[PDB]
Symmetry: C3
Subunit: 263 residues, 3 copies
Amino acid sequence: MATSFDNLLYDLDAATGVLTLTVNRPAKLNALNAATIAELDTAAQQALADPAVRAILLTGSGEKAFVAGADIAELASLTAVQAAGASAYGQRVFAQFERSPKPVVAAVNGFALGGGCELAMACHLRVAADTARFGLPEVSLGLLPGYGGTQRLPQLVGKAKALELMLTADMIKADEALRLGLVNHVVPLAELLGFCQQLLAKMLSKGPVALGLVIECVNAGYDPRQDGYVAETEAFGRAFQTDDFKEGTQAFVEKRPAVFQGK
Amino acid sequence: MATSFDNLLYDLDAATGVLTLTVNRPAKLNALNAATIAELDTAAQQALADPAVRAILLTGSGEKAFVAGADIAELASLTAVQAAGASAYGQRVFAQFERSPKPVVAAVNGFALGGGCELAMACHLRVAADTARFGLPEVSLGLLPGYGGTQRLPQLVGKAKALELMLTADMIKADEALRLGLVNHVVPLAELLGFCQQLLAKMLSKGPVALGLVIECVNAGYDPRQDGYVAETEAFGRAFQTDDFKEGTQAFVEKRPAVFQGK
Amino acid sequence: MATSFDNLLYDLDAATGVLTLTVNRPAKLNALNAATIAELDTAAQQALADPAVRAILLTGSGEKAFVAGADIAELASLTAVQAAGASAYGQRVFAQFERSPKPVVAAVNGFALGGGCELAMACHLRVAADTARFGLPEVSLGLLPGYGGTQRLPQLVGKAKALELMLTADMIKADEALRLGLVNHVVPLAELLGFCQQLLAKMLSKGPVALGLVIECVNAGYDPRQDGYVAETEAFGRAFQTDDFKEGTQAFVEKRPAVFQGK
């Protein structure tokens, strides 16, 4: 469980604290399979535990695919009970990115299909390249999205267009995804990584604890078992106690930059 | 079996499996009344129990209104008690279209107002003509939308624009509905039926059981009484124990067309 | 006294019934403080009790600001518990506008930041001036929104852009806010308070009991504890029991105008 993966690259930029996680099966269009999910799990677990990781930039190797579906031969080999288990597992692994108190941005450099679209939707923000494509083609196999897609797509583009995309299996381009709300920004592919780093810069100059509480409180709003207003009030007093608030307020009245430490 | 109706037209096309259901009161702009609601209840149940029915296309007769309001003089002759009951009934009836495992597409050919707007909103997809208009005028009469509009309009349009439409009783053009998310597509009235046929054709080439499982799963993300992710996991195992799934995966690896049977 | 506030202007037009509430601290850009927030409390309570108040228009003093932040010096002086209590109190006060049976429009004539952006978001509707700018820069201090902004901004803007705004502290113009759903309309500053009067005119011609019943029922669809369909059914029967509904219904049949009275 160190930093050595057969299907991912794990490049920590000690300097910015941004960790680039790259899905790295280029001859397979960065498709998912049992091993890659499990490595995603391990990678995510380690980044959350490492103080030097301040944020996560997720992406795919090459210029054609972010994550383009999954190994269908692997998938077909499972029984129904194992398939229910693989779905429960993929939901847990992806949810680890959604629930993470460190900002997680998906840099969509190509096809984001199926489990790959579902991976991108689990992150807090998406930035797509000119040439990016999205879609949930599971019904074309007599399947349905099993990694949260039936939950996350409606919350990003609404009920009607989530149904249309999941019922027709349509594949859309970056400009449509932008218009629907599936990605936050579209930019040329050559500019993709750099734009995301600028965007992470804008967040990594804010209170790290404050970042985590915001992500937590937004998540609570979308979970009917959680009360987001109560969580928000407790987060508010919690952030108030931190050294970073005492520092953030000093830097605001004195009009100097704030030095946040996560405390 | 008794598919003859005073106020509806039940034309099942036996090649495609598409049931066209037409509201047939063009002299009264297809308004709703106790009889029409009850026929839609009956037709929906027949549509959902007939294996020949693979999808539903809902439209208005006479190319001037989809469904424009409801027989208000009929409504006024009810006690407050019966009125609450008529509300529960109408919204139970509409929910049959929302919860239908067979895709339901509303082809809005003209005015969709009040209960007629709520009927359109209860379908999975809405395609509208250039000349269609949407609104919820119930406050004009000292009433409120009583067939799900206060719930479904926010889902499609966001809380803010939903409050506006229902508090101002504004009528809006199909261009404005397709911008807020209230319809998926706008076309000239003469292409409306042809467009809806192409769109239904995309879905009917997919796994019939998978379609219905998608609909069940985005529905559970919207009612707090159901988990959602757990629904998706149970539906994902369900898809795996179907003939259609073995066929879909084989057809994918062999790169050939898939022949789904709904099993 | 009756309408005697150090920080607010309580101007009630006795004809139309529009109460105009102006946060009045233009030297500090209408920044909130404990006194202003408590005064907005009593203003709201007073407005809901007064039968001559039929709507609320909320705005800021000058050309520069709507409500720009909060007195950070005052805030930093609280204990950790007192801050939590301030968050609890401020979401209670802002929810009075959200839950009001009387419609509440915010006219955002300039800067709407932090607390002020959260105050705008609690109102049913927002009309912006073209010079308006919005933001939640709490994370720049190591805080997070503590007046419901973590809950209401996703409702207005969706998860992805709510996260981006709260985590980047980006300021946006009314151009982008309209595009995102954060305001309903954009008009020139010169036209702003006139537009809102025209908009309040559409609602004040409708059944007053019915306006607050839609506001109840929309709110119930966002509360996971409530079940908005049941609440809509109870509202429909309660509407029937009012004289405005008999008035409203009689007037539609005998195709004539309608004089509502709110009872």
